[PDB]
């Protein structure tokens, strides 16, 4: 299953990317993270609590795609995760149009397909309070 | 080895703040989604929207009084391999009820987890305050 989010954004692509790809910024949409804008780079995305996912940059087209993988390792088939999270951004007169592409959920994770579809609007709209 | 302390007071009984920490549809209002169960060696998940996920196992019970349980997360990197003890105090107070939070097993090369219960367990009790008297008369 994939999970797909999309929204228009009233700014410029170069101002969405930093918030997608500079560390201080993205943990206040999102949170915790090593993230780096360099293809190979691995890196983590946590919680004070300790959750924590693992990574690695996969694509990186400045103001124009950003993918990285989105995974957890797990004994538990429905908590291991595998699965890819791609943003594309397309710029638009008024600013910049986002899309999220999150693919991977299995059939046996109902509860990482639903947390997405559920999260990601949280977490766009952090993010476009960040931006405003 | 260190361990994370968090006390407030609570301006509510015992009796419900109990309720809000062993009932999995209160427990997922102030914590997190999980399929906790108050009885000893019962083996739980806590897990967010987003794919992070806990393994629990209750360690104590003691109704209205003391919560004990495991909060575990074997990770490859020993700076995520989290393995501790999340335990609950309970005191019965004039106007409602102390509430003490211990949760120890921090390795001294775990320092980002260490912090990060630091504050994040005073997040988690802003919600659990919040709801009790959202469910209040």
Redesign the interface.
């Known amino acids: 299953r994939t999970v797909v989010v999309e929204r228009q954004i009233s700014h410029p692509p170069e101002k969405l990317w930093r918030a997608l790809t500079q560390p201080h910024l993205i943990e206040e949409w999102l949170m915790?993270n090593d993230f780096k804008p360099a293809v190979g780079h691995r890196f983590?995305?946590?919680?004070?609590?300790?959750?924590?996912?693992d990574c690695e940059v996969l694509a990186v087209e400045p103001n124009k795609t950003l993918s990285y993988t989105?995974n957890?390792?797990?004994?538990?088939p429905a908590?291991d995760?595998r699965?890819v999270v791609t943003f594309t951004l397309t710029p638009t007169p008024t600013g910049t149009h986002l899309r999220m592409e999150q693919s991977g959920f299995r059939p046996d994770q109902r509860?990482?397909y639903?947390?997405?579809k559920?999260?990601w609007p949280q977490?766009f709209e952090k993010l476009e309070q960040l931006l405003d």
């Open positions: 915790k983590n995305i946590s919680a004070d609590w300790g959750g924590v996912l989105w957890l390792a797990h004994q538990d908590f995760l699965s509860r990482a639903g947390g997405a559920m999260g977490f």
